[PDB]
């Protein structure tokens, strides 16, 4: 199934943060309405924040996270969880190799902000 695609409420500010846990340099692309809105790049094996940003979901609300290592797309796992009908997390994991720990780039999207 498709992973890393989320429908946010339109015209809403949201946070996106990426962590790295891999010897491979992680490239995280955040697409809003099918157009690239942010790009994070970095290497860490100790969960370092490789990028954090505030974005707007625009009129479509469609947010897509893509992860590539060595120009090859990582395998993604994702879900969205809502707490007290109000607090939203869109969660992405990714695997760039064979050990299947799926933490190589971890991406957290959260809203609302402010």
Ligand X SMILES: *C(=O)C[C@@H]1O[C@@H](C)[C@@H](O)[C@@H](O)[C@@H]1O
Give residues in contact with ligand X (CB under 6 A): 21-24, 45, 96-97, 99, 101, 104
Exposure string (b/e) for 7-34, b if CB count within 10 Å is 16 or more?
ebeeeeebebbbbbbbebbbbbbbbbee
45 binds, among ligand X, Ca ion, none (CB under 5 to 8 A by kind): ligand X
* Residues 60-99, mask of contacts with Ca ion (x by CB under 5 A): -----------------------------------x-x-x
Q: Which is nearer to ligand X, 27 or 96 (CB)?
A: 96
C-alpha 6 chain-centroid distance: 10
Cβ(57)–Cβ(12) below 8 Å: yes
Confirm or reject binding of residue 103 to Ca ion (CB under 5 A).
yes
- Indicate which of ligand X, Ca ion, none lies near residue 94 (CB less than 5 to 8 Å, by partner kind): none
| Tokens describing residue 72 | 């090859």
């Amino acid at each position: 199934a498709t992973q890393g695609v989320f429908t946010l409420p339109a015209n809403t500010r949201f946070g996106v943060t990426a962590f790295a846990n891999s010897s491979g340099t992680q490239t995280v692309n955040v697409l809003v309405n099918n157009e690239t809105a942010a790009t994070f790049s970095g290497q860490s094996t100790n969960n370092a924040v490789i990028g954090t940003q505030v974005l707007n979901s625009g009129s479509s609300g469609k947010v897509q996270v893509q992860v590539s290592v060595n120009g090859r797309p990582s395998d993604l796992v994702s879900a969205q969880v809502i707490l007290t009908n109000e607090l939203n997390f869109a969660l992405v994991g990714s695997e760039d190799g064979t050990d299947n720990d799926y933490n190589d780039a971890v991406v957290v999207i959260n809203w609302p902000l402010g």
